[PDB]
Every structure is written in structure tokens, then in C-alpha cells.
């Protein structure tokens, strides 16, 4: 990836999640074998996409040295018999041969939805894709040092049948941070930005509420703005009081 | 409809236990599982 | 689904992966009531390995409860019921 | 659309209905009001813009009073304004009346925003489209309280509403916690005189005339006046030094 | 006597506070290793051995460290025999090392247990 | 001492230290005495706290009683503590009077006597207007005459009960006498009778939610059938289901019971 | 009619959208709650967030005492919250004055609630998405935990919590429950109570609070008083030296 | 592999199994086989498990087809996948 | 200023049928299931008490009410519509029959009273029907024991044995089998435990279940045993440890 994950503590609790399903079962089998349950196989992350989310995704590759595999879903849908079955198919293919290495599919919700009105538009084009997916699950493909990781944006179109282990098992939610998380997310978003020697973490923290990591990052920048035009490098505790209470009040 | 449904129900707990020929035994088997189901919901 | 028809499919799960003396079925069997075998699956599957994450070689009756919350935990809402409120 | 934008007799999945959201936003479209809590007393400012030549200086004021110690100031829509400190005015008489007794501040605070939430859970009954800052000085102590078009109201050490809400608070907060408080009441008028002359900068294309206010224990005794004369120009003038936008 | 059952007690809670649940060292395991080391010089294998299980109950600083402390403490134990090597089955059915994977790839959990194997056998 | 607790206590291991009739002093003055809340229950006293502990009691002394050969004396009693009951709380009565001849039955008694005091329970029932329980107690009756070969006075009295049950209470009962009506044919050696009685009670049993037992009892028949009309590969397959389900059943299916199974399970392999 | 979107009635599915969505925010003053009973007491241990610091504390509260030893806690937007205490204050001194007996919890419950149910059949009148917990140590039946909310309902509980976070403190109470099998902590002295509820509060949000950031009201016999600063810094102090 | 199906097995036994084993018998009777099976739920359950124990059990090939990759775009392919399969 | 609006709430459609009334039918589904059966020889009302958090409890929840001493009254629907009816109808019996009489109400009379109540709120807006369907149960001593079911329009019938709440056809079926005739009190009860034990599942307990009857008023259920000098209550709650022996004599 392009960030570390201390490139984005204050997310924690989900760092903590993702790191206990994803890393470890390549680590040890050994621990999951002995008991006798099968490994984890899925992790979906929902949230809005980059306040944090995209973000987890290429942290948690990184460390692994898993390669990323990006599926857009509209390159899965092309207008020639037997391409769209094909390319889901070949990708997850060489993320055996290859593994370690996430599928990250984006909005799987073009690419296995269940309708909501009936039609075949060119959502027979939806099944297609859906039930490729399903058949190397539910068959003898053999994903567990594969790994697979769908977003979508809000869950309303997974059927039962994803949400049932050995497809899914691992279903991450993205919640605002703590008051400790808010702390800990704009020590390294100032640590990066240069600075006046004396300066208060602490009390931005308070005055915010209902943000997330991408609004944190904003705040940063937001302070930085104000030093451009100031005729400096350096941010002050003055800048960021502004900062943060400006980015308060163009929203709830 | 019903009526279809109940004879080859019946056929099949013959069938099941080798024997080509039914009798009222496995025909008011049959009815009772028929029934059940109209006096669902 | 009825009692006897749930008592299986929780059995049939646990066989695969280690089981405690400890364990006790019959609280398993009131804690779902009527709930297809797809999601009973789900649960069971889940709680087996939440426990390996936790350093436990056997399932115990509080890793399997913890799994339940966790799955059947949608309710961002205060307050759940308008059948009767 | 979702048929809220024009009902108080339904609830939203905002929390709020849209009217009370279109409330808010008039209070923004008037002119600067700020409330600076001191030790010793509470401080009144507002703008009040200059646009032609015909105007007259403190009749056209937007600061009123209630009883003779509540200082009352708001910004957003006039005829919403008026009404409002005028049904605080009657309240306040019946309080006056009936107990004996001037009002308490937080008590004052009630009365208005029984009136004030009234009319969100009424579709027939319009909301209010100002903020009114208000405070003074009581046998409980100094108070500076702050009330909003929902009906929301707590307690402040300093306040602001207006156009320059946002520029306000961010020196109004720095300056309150580098001082206890914003030291005592003649510092105050200085400082507060200083901040309409920076809220200005969000305003500067039409003039203005700066109009102050206190009720302050140590320094006006338990009674509203007007901040004016020699005072008020010594404060333009001290501002005037520093910022030189 | 007293001086030091206080010693092993207010230590302990200094040393969990300075290791926290953040990290290996920050524990001198030393202060672990010397603290044990003190409680068996200082009483009876009874107590001792009471003792080192209700400190366990806690977060006990690792599981590899802990089962370095229970693993000298057994020797001593073999080493003492009559009626002390039926004080050992006490202590090792207690314990959840030998009979739960905390982190079971050690050599020395395993072997607690070959010894009750023995006094079993006996 | 002179506390309920103390004397329920100190009776109970009275038994084993020393004997049954030591005991059983101690269990008579417990319902001769202590004074509890309400109405009576022995007459000189009042019970009802008391009372419910006198039924854990009452059993105890009841299986010593059958070894005793005090087997006469519990048919006297059981019918005689109805009316103890009686006076207090009706909700009592009725819990107390089923749970007894279930007790009475639950270890090894003499015929004679058992039939004496099922009779005699249908007459108190018949006092009131009660029929759910009534229709119940005619069921223990039934299987009773048949083991002791009074097979036509089984018949008679079966075929009045399944009237009653196709137009009124106890839609469960059922299942249990078409089973009953079975072994009173299949053991008159009547092979077609008992071959129609029985899908008849798998018609029913699998309209309702019936206990886990009751249906294997009825594979247990199934078996039966198919050994004597042959085919004994069909027959293991049975009785392996019928032993599945008295293994989950652990020992709340009989020794005895669980044993005639295991012996068929193995017999119908030796035979094909 | 032929309006469901402008005015309130019965929804065909049968779930009235008006409820429903009263039932969601409340949540908009970053708000958890839960009250718990000892043997002797009730304790409320309630969540503060201070988003300005041209803001005093010790003004913001969401206990608002009704009579002398009643309590009760709104979980809601202040606006709201506070329209409903005036009302509540002044019915429970109504009722006092009359029947010459102090309002017991459910009686104020079940009076809120019902009109409540009046202004939800009202097609120019809104209603309420206030929840209401109402919490006092009667000596009629003991110490009483019994919550409303907005639709009319109410009923009684062992302790309660609200907040988004609701599951993970309803959890945390169930285990200590079903371990003693008691509805209650029985726990003498209300010191012990509060600060294991502060415990099972700092586990389930995760997260230590200050005394600024927790305010706790206790509920005692004949009395009942909010917790100052000062004293709320004790409680959080006496726990780091357990382990 | 799965357990507590016990209804949908004694279904699909009847239906798939039957008829292959047992062709004559239907015949003789003079009242028509099953044919076709529709199994209707979601899939993965534990379904597609009984599907595939019988194909094994009665020692038929297993067939798997994509229902939905002929949906081919055109006239060529998909029409013809179906005469062959 | 407010309070011009009694544009009605209910309509009539196309069909002739009432808006409201159709949605207030599906509530009535939505609920619990209550029963009731007259033996002749008494009245037992019986329901399902359940409750919306674990931490809640039903122990201490209601859902039959005392309407006046010798009448209680269970419903199915909504919750809240229910407490503000029995409120009402509790201050018409007081008012109108102990003020102006001072015997307590005959029991279709008090039923027409509940009737007027809910049909009022059904003509007039600014208010709308209650969603709730009531089986009120009484005894008055120049009728005997009677039963009476109010339906969400404000509609009644005399009904010997009905049920409503989930599986409200099928629950009555079962009872026109079980029960025919006249049968006692006592063994109405054994009976009502039964088809309330078939409707539900994953709850048994006498902690969840409700049952009462209006079949006997004694001195100590008059509160004295002194010399009567009114009747005092018919209805009688049988206890939670009452309700559990009854379960294990079926």
C-alpha cells in the first residue's frame, strides 16, 4: 500500500479486527488446524470510502507484502461472449498461484446484487458475475490463504448466503473514533506537517465531535491553508483552533 | 389437484419399500400429509 | 425449525473442531428459536473461530453467546419493537 | 422534497424539521452580536450597519432591555426579534408580580424557551429566525446564557451569532482562556470593540456603527446602561492602533 | 514473615502497572523471576503454591513467563516428595497452560504434565 | 428438632444409617405437624409450603414401600391424600394427583394393586366436571390389562377412548394408544390389525409435535412388523433409529428398554 | 388523508414511520446512559461532552430533579428534553399538593406516555422523541427502574441503557446478572455501586473518562442529589489500585 | 458433512435417487416419475452438499453448470453449450 | 394559534371501506397471543406477557387490567393505545354507575361504553381509532358470567370462546374441538394453557404467562372478612407458581 497503519491509528479497534483475520491465519494455520475449524476466508468493509476505509484496505496489504488486486466492477461486464466470467475467474486464478494476495473488489452491489424491481437490464450481466463468485466458493477451489475482501458502501444487497462463513465470516463496521482515537489520529496528522514547538493536541480533540479520519485530515490541512497565507511553514495551536472549528460548523 | 398429489405420494412409500401394487394403507398415509398442508397459515 | 430438528445441525459443526466437557447443548437450543439452518450454520461457524483468536483449544458456552451478540448486533436504533412498541 | 419543509405536525428523520432548518439560517444572514462574560459582569456588543446617511445613532438599536438589569440582544430577522423580547417582557412582569422578586437569569432563560420550543411542535405557530444572547447580573451571580431558534440554551462564558459567528468565537476563546475570563468589565469594551472591527472584514463593503452595552456589578451597579460617550470612542480608537485592516 | 508477603504483593501491582497490556518488557521479568524465587525461600509449598495461582488469575505478564515460573516452581516440589508430590496435582489441575493453547508450542507445558503422568502411574 | 427443614433433612439420611421405619416415624410427624400458612392438609395441622415438601417425601417412602412389601399400604394412601389436597388450592390438586400414579408406576409393582388405584382416581376426577385428565388415567389402565393378558378388557376399553379424542381433548393421546392398540393385536398374533393400528400412529405423530420417545417407540413396531412379515434389513434400519434416539435420551429411556433394542439391532443382522 | 407524509396515522405494514424515526435520533448530544439499582440506592451515571470552551460544565446536565427525591434522566435532544421536565415538574407538584403523596416513577411514566400516544394521534401536534428514565428509591417498593419511550410504552427493568452502545452495556449487565442471578448489586454503601458501574461503562464504550467528561446522580433514601466534580475524581482514582 | 436437514434429505432420497436406481419400478406401478427438482432457497447451505453426496453415492457424474454464463451476448456460443451439455 | 382542524382521519374509499381501520386490522395481527373462554361456570382470560429487552421484565409488566373490580379486560395490538383506552373507560364506569348507581356496571353495558369510546375517535379528527380489539370478561350478578369482544371500529359480539393474536383462525379452531358443551371452570383452564402453549414457542415459563379467571369472589378477595357491604372483586389472578403446576398436569 501507500500508508502504514500508524499512518492511521485512531481507527483502532477496526486495525486491531483486521489485523487478527487477515495476517494470522497465514502466519499459523498451525493454531486453527489443531482446534479443527476451518480459517477465515472473508472480510467486507462498509462505510463511507475514504474517511478511513480505503485506508485499511492498503495498510493491511502492506505489512503482509500482499499484492493488491484492484477489480473495477465496470471492466467486469465487457460486451463479447464469455469475458465477464473470465475475468473474475483468472483474477482469483493467480491470486492462488500467486498467494498471498486480496481481491479487493469495489462495490460488489454491481457485481451481485439481487435486484429490487426484477429486471434484466443488463442485470442478467449482475448474475453472471455474482454467480461466478459463488461457484469457487461453494466448490473446490481452495481460498484460506487467498483472501477476498468486498466493499460496498451500505449492506442491502448481500444475499443470506454471503453473510453464511467460508464466503464472509469477518464483517467490519466503520464507526467516528474515540475521544481517544481523535487524540491519537491528529498526533501523527500534525506530527507530518511542520510546526510551532509548542502546541496542544488536546484541546482541537474536545471541540470536535461526529468526524472521521478523512475530516481529522482536512482539519491538518485546513490550518496549513491559513499559514500559506500567514507567510510560513508553520502551523500554530492559533491556526488549528480556527481550523477545527470551521470544519464544525459547515457541518453537523 | 390435490387428488393427483395423493396418488403418487402414495406410490412412492410403496415404491420405497419394493412393492408395485397400493392399498388403502399407504392411500390414507398419503391423504394425511396432503391435509396438513391446507391447514398451514 | 423445532427443537429436535436445531440440536443436529449445532452437533454436526462442532464435531469438525475441538468440543469442551463444559459445553452444555440444551442452552444452544433455546437461544435460537426457529431460525433456519443457514443462519444457525452462521453463528456456530463463526464462534468457532473468535475462539482461536481468543487462545482456546475448546469452545466454550460464553464464546459461543459472544458470537450470537456479535452476528445478531445490527441495531444502530434506541429502542427495538413497533409490533406492539 | 419530503413534505417537512412545510409541517411542524410530523417528525423527521433529521431530528429537526426542515422549517427550523430554514430558521437557523436567517439568524446568519443578520448582523454580528456578541455576549463577553467578565468577573465582575456580562458586556453586550453588536454591529449595526450604516448604508445611507438619513440613519440616526442609538434608536435604530437592536439591543432591548427587560426589567432594568436584562440586557437583550439578537441577530437575524427584526419582526421576529421584537415579538420575541416582547413576550419575554410579559412573562417577565408576571414573574415580577406574582414572586416579588426580579427575575433570575436561568429562570428568564425558561420562560422564553417554553415559548420559543412551542412553536417546533406546532405547524401553525411560525419558528423564530433570530439567536438572542442575554444575561446580566443576579442575586445568584453573573450569567450570560445564549438561545437558539430549537430552543436549545446553556450556559456560556462567552457567545456568539451572527454573520462573523465563527471569526468571533475563535478570538473570543483564545482571548477568555488566555485571561480568566476576559478580565473585568472596562477591559471587556476594549476587547469587544476589537472583535466587531475584525467581524467587519466578513461585512466590509457597508459601514457600521459600533454600539456597546453592560450590566455590570462593580462597575454600573446592578443596572443596564448603554456603553456611549467618552468610553465608546476611546474603545474605535484603541482598536484602530492594533488592527489596521 | 509479614515484610515479605508485602514485598510479593506491592511489587506485583507495580510491576503490572509498569508492564501494562501494551507490551513484553516494561516488566523487568527479572523483578517476576525474583519475586517467585523470594516466595519460595519465604514459606511452605502449601503457600507458595496458593499463592502463584492467585496471581495468574490476573493478566500474569505472558503466558511463556508464567509457565517458566510454574515450571520451577514443580521441580522444587519433586524434589521435597512425601506428601508434597500430591500437592503437585493440586496445582497443575488449576492451571489452564497445560490443558487450554495460550500459546502451546512449548516443550515445558507438555512436560508438566508427563510428570503427573508419573505420580498417577505411582 | 421441630422444623420442617430440620426433620425433612434429618429423615432423609435417617434411612440409610439406621432403617426405613426409623424414617418413616419422622415422616408421618411431618404431616401431623408443623403449622404453615392456609388450610389443612392433615387435619391437625396446616400445610401448604410443608405440604409440597410432604410430596418429596411421599416418594421416597413410596419406593421403599415396594420393596417392602408395603406395596398394599401405598394403594391405600395415594387415593387417601387426594382429599388432603382438596381443601387447599385446586391448582395443587390437580399437579399432585397425575405426578402420583406416575410414582407408583415408576418402580416395579404388583399388578393387582395398580389397577385398583387407577380406578379409583377416575371416580374422584368424575366428583368434579375434570376430563382432560380423566381421558389421561384411562390410558395407564389400558396398558396395564394387556401385560397382564386381559387383552379383550384392553380392546374395549381402547375403542371408547378413540372416540373422544376425535371429537374432543388431547389430540397428543392419540399416538400413544394406536401404538398401545398394536401390541394388544401383534401379541394375539393378529399380524393385519396391528399393521393398520400402527399407520395409523404415524399419521398422527407426524401431524404434531410428539416427545422423542413416543415416535421411537413407534419405529420400535415398525421393526416388529417387518420382521415377522420379514425382511429384516428394513427391520435394522429401524431399530437403529429407535437406538439413536434412546442414546441422546441417555437413562430417561429404561435399562431394560434400551437393552431389547441393542438385542434386536443385533439379532436382525445374525438372521440376514 | 390520503397524507401520511405531512400528518401522523397507522402505516398498512404497520410500523408508523413518525415512531420509527424518534426512535433513531436522539442521539444528537453525543449521549450514553444507564442506571443501575443497589440494595439501598439508584445510581445514573450519564455521559458529558464539552464541544466549546466558551462553555461552563457544571450548566449542562441531563438529569433534571423533579421533586426532592425523584430523578429522572433524558436521553434526547435538549430542546426537547427540557419541555418535557418543565411539564413532568409541575404534574409530579400537582399530584403532591392533591393526594398529599410524593409521584412514584411509574405513575409520572405511564402519564407522560400516555399523552404522548394523544400527540401521535394528532395531525397538527408532533410528538416527543424523548426517553424518559425515571429513577428514585421509593420506600414503597424499594428502589424502581422504569423507562418510557416516546411511543407510549413503558416498562420496568433490572437497569437500563440507552445510547448507540445500548448492546454493549446490555451485555456486560447480563453476564454480572446471570452470575449472581440477582436484578440487582447488593452492595452496601452506594460507593461500591457507582464505581462498578463506572467499570462496566469504561468497558463497553472503551475508553477512560474525567471528571468532566462523566456526571452521576444518586438516588438515596428520601433524597436525591447529583454528584459534583470533585467527588466524581475519587471514584475514577479508587479503581486503578485494584490490579 | 452437514446434519438437522433431515425433511430436505428424506426429499431429495426420493426424488434424484430413486428413479436412477430404480427405473422399473415406476413403470410397473403406471404412475409417472419425477423428472425434475426444483430446489428453491438460497444456496450453499448445506444444499449443494446433499447434491453432491448423492451424484457421489450412487457413483453419477457431477455436472456443474453455469446457468448464467450462457448468458453469452450473441448467437454463437451459448445456444450450442446447451445441445452439448 | 391552533386547534381549527376536525377534517376527519377516516375515510371512506372506493370500496366503501375505512382507511384506518384496515391498517388497525394488521396491528391487531402484529400482536400476542390472548384468548378467552367461557366455561358458563366462569371466565379465563389468558395472554402471553413479553417484553423488548432482555433487561426488561414481564414480571412486571400488565397486560390485562382491572376495568372495574369484578371485569378485566386483554387485548391485541399496540401497547400504547391500549393503556389510554382502559384509563378512559376506567373514569366512565366510576363516574356514570357509582355516582348515579352504586352498583358496579353491568358488563355490556361498560362494553357499550368502550364501543361509543372508540367509534368517536374514529368519526372526529384530530384523533384516530384505537388500533386495538379488546376481549372484556366480567360477571354481573342478574346476567351470570358473560364475554364480550370489541372490535377496532368500535363493533361488538357476544362470543362463547374466540381468540385473537397470531394464528387467530387457527387458535379458535382448536378451541370449537377441545371444548364443547359445557365443561368446568377448572378444566377450562387446563385447556386454555394448552392452545396458549401451542401458539407460542421458546417461552413456557408462569413468569411470561398470564392467566386469570372471573369465577369467585371471596373474603379474601374482598379485603375483610367482615360482613359484606359491597361485592369486591370476581377476577383473580392465578400466580406465577399456580400457573407452573398446571403446565406439568397437561
Known amino acids: 500500500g501507500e500508508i502504514t497503519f500508524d499512518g492511521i491509528g485512531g481507527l483502532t479497534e477496526q486495525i486491531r479486527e483486521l489485523r487478527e483475520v487477515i495476517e494470522l491465519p497465514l502466519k499459523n494455520p498451525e493454531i486453527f488446524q489443531r482446534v479443527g475449524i476451518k480459517p477465515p476466508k472473508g472480510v467486507l468493509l462498509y462505510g463511507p470510502p475514504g474517511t478511513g476505509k480505503t485506508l485499511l484496505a492498503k495498510a493491511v496489504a502492506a505489512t503482509i507484502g500482499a499484492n493488491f488486486i484492484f477489480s473495477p466492477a465496470s471492466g467486469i461486464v465487457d460486451k463479447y461472449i464469455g469475458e465477464s466470467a473470465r475475468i473474475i475467474r483468472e483474477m482469483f486464478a493467480y491470486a492462488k498461484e500467486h498467494e498471498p494476495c486480496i481481491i479487493f473488489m469495489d462495490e460488489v452491489d454491481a457485481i451481485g446484487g439481487r435486484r429490487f424491481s426484477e429486471g434484466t437490464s443488463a442485470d442478467r450481466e449482475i448474475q453472471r458475475t455474482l454467480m461466478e463468485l459463488l461457484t469457487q466458493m461453494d466448490g473446490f477451489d481452495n481460498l484460506g490463504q487467498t483472501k477476498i475482501i468486498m466493499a460496498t458502501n451500505r449492506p442491502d444487497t448481500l444475499d443470506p448466503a454471503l453473510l453464511r462463513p467460508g464466503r464472509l465470516d469477518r464483517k467490519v463496521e466503520i464507526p467516528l473514533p474515540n475521544e481517544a482515537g481523535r487524540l491519537e489520529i491528529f498526533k501523527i496528522h500534525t506530527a507530518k506537517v511542520k510546526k510551532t514547538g509548542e502546541f496542544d493536541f488536546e484541546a482541537a480533540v474536545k471541540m470536535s465531535d461526529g468526524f472521521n479520519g478523512a475530516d481529522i485530515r482536512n482539519c491538518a490541512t485546513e490550518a496549513g491553508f491559513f499559514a500559506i497565507r500567514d507567510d510560513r511553514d508553520h502551523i500554530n495551536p492559533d491556526d488549528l483552533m480556527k481550523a477545527v472549528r470551521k470544519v464544525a460548523e459547515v457541518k453537523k | ?41 | 425449525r423445532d427443537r429436535r430438528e436445531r440440536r443436529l445441525i449445532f452437533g454436526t459443526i462442532a464435531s469438525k473442531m475441538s468440543l469442551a466437557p463444559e459445553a452444555d447443548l440444551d442452552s444452544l437450543i433455546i437461544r435460537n428459536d426457529s431460525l433456519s439452518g443457514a443462519v444457525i450454520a452462521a453463528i456456530m461457524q463463526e464462534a468457532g473461530l473468535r475462539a482461536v483468536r481468543k487462545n482456546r483449544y475448546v469452545i466454550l458456552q460464553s464464546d459461543l453467546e459472544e458470537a450470537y451478540a456479535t452476528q445478531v448486533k445490527t441495531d444502530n436504533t434506541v429502542d427495538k419493537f413497533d409490533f406492539y412498541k | 422534497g419530503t413534505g417537512y419543509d412545510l409541517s411542524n405536525s410530523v417528525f423527521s428523520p433529521d431530528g429537526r424539521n426542515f422549517q427550523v432548518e430554514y430558521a437557523v439560517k436567517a439568524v446568519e444572514n443578520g448582523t454580528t452580536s456578541i455576549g463577553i462574560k467578565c468577573n465582575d459582569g456580562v458586556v453586550f456588543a453588536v454591529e449595526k450597519l450604516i448604508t445611507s446617511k438619513l440613519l440616526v445613532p442609538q434608536k435604530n438599536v437592536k439591543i432591548q432591555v427587560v426589567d432594568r438589569h436584562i440586557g437583550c440582544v439578537y441577530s437575524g430577522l427584526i419582526p421576529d426579534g421584537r415579538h420575541l423580547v416582547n413576550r419575554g417582557r410579559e412573562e417577565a412582569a408576571s414573574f415580577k408580580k406574582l414572586y416579588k422578586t426580579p427575575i433570575p437569569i436561568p429562570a428568564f432563560a425558561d420562560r422564553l424557551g417554553q415559548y420559543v420550543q412551542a412553536h417546533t411542535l406546532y405547524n401553525s405557530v411560525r419558528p423564530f429566525g433570530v439567536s438572542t444572547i442575554f444575561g446580566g447580573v443576579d442575586k445568584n451571580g453573573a450569567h450570560l446564557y445564549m438561545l437558539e431558534p430549537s430552543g436549545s440554551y446553556w450556559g456560556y462564558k462567552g457567545a456568539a451569532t451572527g454573520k462573523g459567528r465563527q471569526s468571533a468565537k475563535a478570538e473570543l476563546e483564545k482571548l477568555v482562556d488566555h485571561h480568566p475570563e476576559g478580565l473585568s468589565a472596562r477591559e471587556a469594551v476594549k476587547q469587544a470593540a476589537k472583535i466587531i472591527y475584525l467581524a467587519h472584514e466578513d461585512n466590509k463593503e457597508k459601514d457600521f456603527e459600533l454600539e456597546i452595552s453592560w450590566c455590570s456589578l462593580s462597575e454600573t451597579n446592578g443596572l443596564h446602561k448603554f456603553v456611549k460617550g467618552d468610553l465608546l470612542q476611546e474603545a474605535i480608537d484603541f482598536a484602530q492602533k492594533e488592527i489596521n485592516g | 514473615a509479614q515484610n515479605d508477603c508485602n514485598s510479593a504483593l506491592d511489587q506485583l501491582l507495580v510491576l503490572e502497572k509498569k508492564t501494562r497490556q501494551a507490551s513484553d518488557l516494561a516488566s523487568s521479568k527479572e523483578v517476576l523471576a525474583k519475586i517467585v524465587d523470594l516466595l519460595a525461600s519465604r514459606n511452605k509449598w502449601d503457600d507458595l503454591n496458593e499463592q502463584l495461582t492467585l496471581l495468574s488469575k490476573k493478566h500474569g505478564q505472558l503466558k511463556l513467563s508464567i509457565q517458566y515460573m510454574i515450571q520451577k516452581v514443580m521441580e522444587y516440589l519433586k524434589s521435597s516428595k512425601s506428601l508434597d508430590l500430591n500437592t503437585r496435582i493440586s496445582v497443575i489441575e488449576t492451571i489452564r497452560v497445560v490443558t487450554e493453547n495460550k500459546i502451546f508450542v512449548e516443550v515445558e507445558r507438555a512436560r508438566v504434565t508427563k510428570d503427573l503422568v508419573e505420580i498417577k502411574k505411582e | 428438632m421441630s422444623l420442617p427443614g430440620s426433620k425433612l433433612e434429618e429423615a432423609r439420611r435417617l434411612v440409610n444409617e439406621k432403617q426405613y421405619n426409623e424414617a418413616e416415624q419422622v415422616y408421618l410427624s411431618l404431616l401431623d405437624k408443623d403449622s404453615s400458612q392456609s388450610s389443612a392438609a392433615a387435619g391437625a395441622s396446616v400445610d401448604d409450603k410443608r405440604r409440597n415438601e410432604q410430596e418429596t417425601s411421599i416418594l421416597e417412602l413410596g419406593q421403599l414401600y415396594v420393596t417392602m412389601g408395603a406395596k398394599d399400604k401405598l394403594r391405600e394412601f395415594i387415593p387417601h391424600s387426594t382429599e388432603y389436597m382438596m381443601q387447599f388450592a385446586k391448582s395443587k390438586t390437580v399437579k399432585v394427583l397425575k405426578t402420583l400414579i406416575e410414582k407408583f408406576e415408576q418402580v416395579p409393582d404388583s399388578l393387582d394393586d395398580q389397577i385398583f388405584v387407577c380406578e379409583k382416581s377416575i371416580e374422584f376426577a368424575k366428583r368434579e366436571k375434570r376430563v382432560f385428565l380423566k381421558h389421561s388415567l384411562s390410558i395407564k389402565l389400558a396398558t396395564l390389562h394387556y401385560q397382564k393378558k386381559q387383552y379383550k378388557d384392553s380392546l374395549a376399553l381402547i375403542n371408547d377412548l378413540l372416540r373422544e379424542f376425535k371429537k374432543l381433548d388431547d389430540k397428543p393421546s392419540l399416538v400413544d394408544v394406536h401404538l398401545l392398540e398394536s401390541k394388544v393385536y401383534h401379541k394375539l398374533r393378529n399380524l393385519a390389525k396391528s399393521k393398520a393400528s400402527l399407520t395409523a400412529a404415524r399419521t398422527a405423530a407426524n401431524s404434531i409435535y410428539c416427545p422423542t420417545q413416543t415416535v421411537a417407540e413407534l419405529d420400535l413396531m415398525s421393526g416388529i412388523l417387518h420382521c415377522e412379515d420379514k425382511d429384516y434389513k428394513t427391520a435394522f434400519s429401524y431399530f437403529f433409529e429407535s437406538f439413536e434416539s434412546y442414546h441422546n435420551l441417555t437413562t430417561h429411556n429404561s435399562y431394560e428398554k434400551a437393552c431389547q433394542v441393542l438385542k434386536y439391532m443385533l439379532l436382525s443382522k445374525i438372521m440376514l | 388523508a390520503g397524507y401520511d407524509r405531512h400528518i401522523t396515522i397507522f402505516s398498512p405494514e404497520g410500523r408508523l414511520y413518525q415512531v420509527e424515526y424518534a426512535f433513531k435520533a436522539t442521539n444528537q448530544t453525543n449521549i450514553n446512559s444507564l442506571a443501575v439499582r443497589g440494595k439501598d440506592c439508584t445510581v445514573v451515571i450519564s455521559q458529558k461532552k464539552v464541544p466549546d470552551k466558551l462553555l461552563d460544565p457544571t450548566t449542562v446536565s441531563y438529569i433534571f430533579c423533579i421533586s426532592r427525591t425523584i430523578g429522572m434522566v433524558v436521553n434526547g435532544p435538549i430542546p426537547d428534553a427540557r419541555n418535557a421536565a418543565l411539564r413532568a415538574k409541575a404534574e409530579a407538584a400537582e399530584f403532591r399538593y392533591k393526594y398529599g403523596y410524593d409521584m412514584p416513577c411509574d405513575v409520572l411514566a405511564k402519564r407522560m406516555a400516555n399523552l404522548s400516544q394523544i400527540y401521535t394521534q394528532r395531525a397538527y401536534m408532533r410528538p416527543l422523541g424523548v426517553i424518559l428514565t425515571f429513577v428514585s428509591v421509593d420506600e414503597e417498593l424499594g428502589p424502581s427502574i422504569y423507562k418510557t419511550d416516546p411511543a407510549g410504552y413503558y416498562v420496568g427493568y433490572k437497569a437500563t441503557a440507552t445510547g448507540p452502545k445500548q448492546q454493549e452495556i446490555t451485555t456486560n449487565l447480563e453476564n454480572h446478572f446471570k452470575k449472581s442471578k440477582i436484578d440487582h448489586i447488593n452492595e452496601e454503601s452506594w460507593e461500591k455501586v457507582v464505581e462498578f458501574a463506572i467499570t462496566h461503562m469504561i468497558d463497553a464504550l472503551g475508553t477512560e473518562f474525567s471528571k468532566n467528561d462523566l456526571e452521576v446522580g444518586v438516588a438515596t433514601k428520601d433524597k436525591f442529589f447529583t454528584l459534583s466534580a470533585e467527588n466524581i475524581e475519587e471514584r475514577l482514582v479508587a479503581i486503578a489500585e485494584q490490579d | 458433512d452437514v446434519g438437522g436437514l433431515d425433511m430436505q434429505k428424506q426429499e431429495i432420497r426420493e426424488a434424484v435417487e430413486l428413479p436412477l436406481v430404480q427405473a422399473d419400478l415406476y413403470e410397473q406401478i403406471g404412475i409417472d416419475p419425477p423428472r425434475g427438482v426444483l430446489l428453491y432457497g438460497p444456496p450453499g447451505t448445506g444444499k449443494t452438499m446433499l447434491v453432491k453426496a448423492v451424484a457421489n453415492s450412487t457413483k453419477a457424474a457431477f455436472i456443474r453448470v453455469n446457468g448464467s454464463e450462457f448468458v453469452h451476448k450473441y448467437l454463437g456460443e451459448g445456444p450450442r453449450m446447451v445441445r452439448d451439455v | 394559534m391552533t386547534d381549527r382542524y376536525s377534517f376527519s382521519l377516516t375515510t371512506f374509499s372506493p370500496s366503501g371501506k375505512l382507511g384506518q381501520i384496515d391498517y388497525a386490522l394488521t396491528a391487531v395481527k402484529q400482536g400476542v397471543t390472548s384468548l378467552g373462554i367461557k366455561a358458563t361456570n366462569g371466565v379465563v382470560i389468558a395472554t402471553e406477557k413479553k417484553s423488548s429487552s432482555p433487561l426488561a421484565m414481564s414480571e412486571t409488566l400488565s397486560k390485562v387490567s382491572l376495568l372495574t373490580p369484578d371485569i378485566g379486560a386483554v387485548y391485541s395490538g399496540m401497547g400504547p393505545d391500549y393503556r389510554v383506552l382502559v384509563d378512559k373507560s376506567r373514569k366512565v364506569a366510576h363516574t356514570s354507575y357509582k355516582r348515579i348507581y352504586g352498583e358496579y356496571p353491568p358488563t355490556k353495558l361498560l362494553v357499550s361504553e368502550v364501543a361509543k369510546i372508540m367509534q368517536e375517535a374514529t368519526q372526529s379528527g384530530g384523533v384516530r381509532p384505537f388500533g386495538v380489539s379488546l376481549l372484556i370478561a366480567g360477571h354481573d350478578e342478574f346476567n351470570g358470567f358473560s364475554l364480550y369482544q370489541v372490535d377496532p371500529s368500535g363493533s361488538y359480539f357476544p362470543w362463547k370462546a374466540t381468540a385473537i393474536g397470531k394464528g387467530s383462525v387457527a387458535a379458535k379452531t382448536f378451541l370449537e374441538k377441545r371444548w364443547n358443551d359445557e365443561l368446568e371452570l377448572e378444566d377450562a383452564i387446563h385447556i386454555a394453557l394448552l392452545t396458549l402453549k401451542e401458539s407460542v414457542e421458546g417461552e413456557f415459563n408462569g413468569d411470561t404467562i398470564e392467566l386469570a379467571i372471573i369465577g369467585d369472589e371471596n373474603p379474601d378477595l374482598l379485603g375483610y372478612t367482615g360482613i359484606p357491604t359491597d361485592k369486591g372483586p370476581r377476577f383473580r389472578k392465578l400466580t406465577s407458581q399456580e400457573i407452573n403446576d398446571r403446565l406439568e398436569a397437561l
Not at chain 2, 5 to 24: K, P
Request: with cysteine; proline share 0%; glycine share 8%.
Open chain 2, 1 to 41: 389437484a390435490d387428488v393427483k398429489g395423493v396418488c403418487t405420494e402414495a406410490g412412492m412409500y410403496a415404491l420405497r419399500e419394493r412393492r408395485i401394487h397400493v392399498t388403502q394403507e399407504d392411500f390414507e398415509l398419503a391423504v394425511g400429509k396432503v391435509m396438513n398442508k391446507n391447514q398451514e397459515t
